[PDB]
Amino acid sequence: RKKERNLHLQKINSIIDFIKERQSEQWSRQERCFQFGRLGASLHNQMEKDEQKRIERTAKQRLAALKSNLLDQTKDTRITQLLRQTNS
């Protein structure tokens, strides 16, 4: 009798022990996608920053060419608008 209860007690003890183990070990589907998002955001910050730099560089090159002689299209339709006012 006594040992039968003790067996049961240790059985459930080990059950709980395996459970509490996995509570710290597991790391689940949600853990992956959450980390991916945090990761992705930093990728966008760097990649986004690089894109901004590239756009700035292109603008700088265009400005330099003009001196030697979105807004890249706004100025074309704006100067074309004005051009058309003069053409007409």
């Binding site: 209860r5 395996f18 459970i19 689940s28 589907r29």
Partner: protein, 393 residues
């Protein structure tokens, strides 16, 4: 640890939850009921049943799969349900993967009858490679890291209370209150019917309403009074003579008719009180049938089954508040209050998972958890030999 994975199926009284042991969330959850169509056609699936409801075809009928005991009811239909899951949600032959299922704690009386039927289904009909069945409240306590626990199942189809002492479901102390989610759904429907247009195919529509706007209502409109509404009301009136939030209004749109329903706080509280004072429902109920005294009863009976002083200190410091209904705001605190009233000499320690999702599927998660242990042999895994033995003379 082990090279395995499995199918977990929880036939709840309202929701059937099923999925793979590989994942945190269930593969799918469908209503524990189905639409029978005529030749014989069985509809399973949340959206599918909704679509059937939209059809409104004469002859469609709703049948549940789980009885008042939390046990399988229409076994032939049960076959069809599981078959459905294996073909459309799990999408795998039932013969390849292992199956772990569960059931609520009972008094043990139907254990053998149920196992016989399961062996017939699992082995004789589905050829399931291996079979195991576990106790839900037990699993819940275990997932909480508890060896002893007072499981308070504030769910639908009644309220289950299961005292667990040293990993032992005290079957004699296990009680199953007839009051729960379903009851409240009925009361809500009946109380709000006065504000709704007009105040079996019809019953199929009842199911629809229950699965939709009624559920929406109870998710936010209901609230549990901190104290006994009656005494609390008096208290505020006393204080008024010496602010009273009970007059505060809450709003809810009745989607299908596009109209605003407005209730005061007291009324919201009135619904909650039915679980504590069922004698206010009608003359068919006793004061002892409220959750307060039911709990006390089961606590005391647990003491009777084995050193009451210690038993009370044990159960009252390992209280698990769970079940879907437990999400009604304030419910948890009210349980604490009821416990302090009936056990003012004991320190109370309760537990409750703040994530709504976790509670809704906690039974499944418990099964999930047990299904994921590395010491394979701990479970009472069953095979064809057990079906055979049973049928051997």
């Amino acid at each position: 640890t082990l090279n395995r994975k499995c199918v977990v199926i929880h036939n709840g009284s309202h929701r059937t939850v099923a999925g793979f042991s590989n994942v945190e969330l269930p593969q799918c959850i469908i209503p524990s009921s189905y639409i029978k169509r005529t030749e014989a056609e069985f509809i399973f699936g949340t959206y599918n049943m909704i679509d059937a409801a939209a059809e409104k075809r004469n002859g469609d009928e709703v049948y549940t799969l789980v009885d008042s005991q939390g046990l399988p009811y229409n076994w032939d239909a049960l076959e069809m349900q599981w078959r459905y899951l294996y073909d459309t949600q799990l999408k795998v032959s039932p013969e390849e993967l292992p199956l772990v299922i569960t059931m609520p704690a009972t008094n043990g009386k139907p254990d053998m009858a149920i196992l016989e039927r399961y062996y017939e289904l699992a082995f004789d009909k589905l050829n399931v490679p291996v079979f195991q069945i576990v106790i839900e409240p037990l699993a819940i306590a275990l997932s909480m890291g508890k060896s002893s626990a007072f499981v308070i199942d504030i769910g639908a189809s009644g309220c289950n209370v299961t005292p667990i002492i040293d990993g032992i479901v005290v079957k004699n102390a296990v009680v199953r209150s007839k009051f729960g989610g379903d009851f409240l759904d009925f009361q809500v429907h009946e109380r709000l019917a006065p504000l709704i247009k007009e105040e079996q195919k019809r019953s199929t529509d009842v199911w629809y309403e229950a699965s939709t706007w009624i559920q929406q209502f109870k998710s936010t409109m209901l609230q549990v009074s901190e104290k006994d509404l009656f005494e609390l009301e008096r208290y505020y009136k006393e204080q008024a003579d010496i602010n009273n939030p009970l007059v505060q209004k809450k709003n809810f749109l009745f989607k299908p008719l596009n109209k605003t329903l407005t209730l005061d706080l007291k009324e919201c509280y009135q619904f909650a009180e039915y679980l504590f004072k069922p004698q206010l429902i009608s003359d068919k109920f006793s004061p002892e049938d409220g959750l307060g005294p039911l709990m006390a009863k089961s606590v005391k009976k647990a003491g009777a089954s084995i050193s009451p002083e210690q038993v009370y200190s044990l159960l009252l410091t390992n209280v698990i508040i769970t079940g879907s209904t437990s999400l009604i705001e304030g419910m948890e605190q009210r349980i604490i209050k009821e416990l302090s009233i009936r056990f003012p000499q004991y320190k109370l320690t309760t537990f409750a998972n703040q994530v709504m999702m976790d509670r809704k599927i906690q039974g499944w998660l418990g099964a999930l958890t047990m299904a994921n242990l590395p010491s394979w042999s701990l479970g009472k895994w069953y095979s064809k030999e057990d079906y055979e033995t049973l049928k051997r003379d």
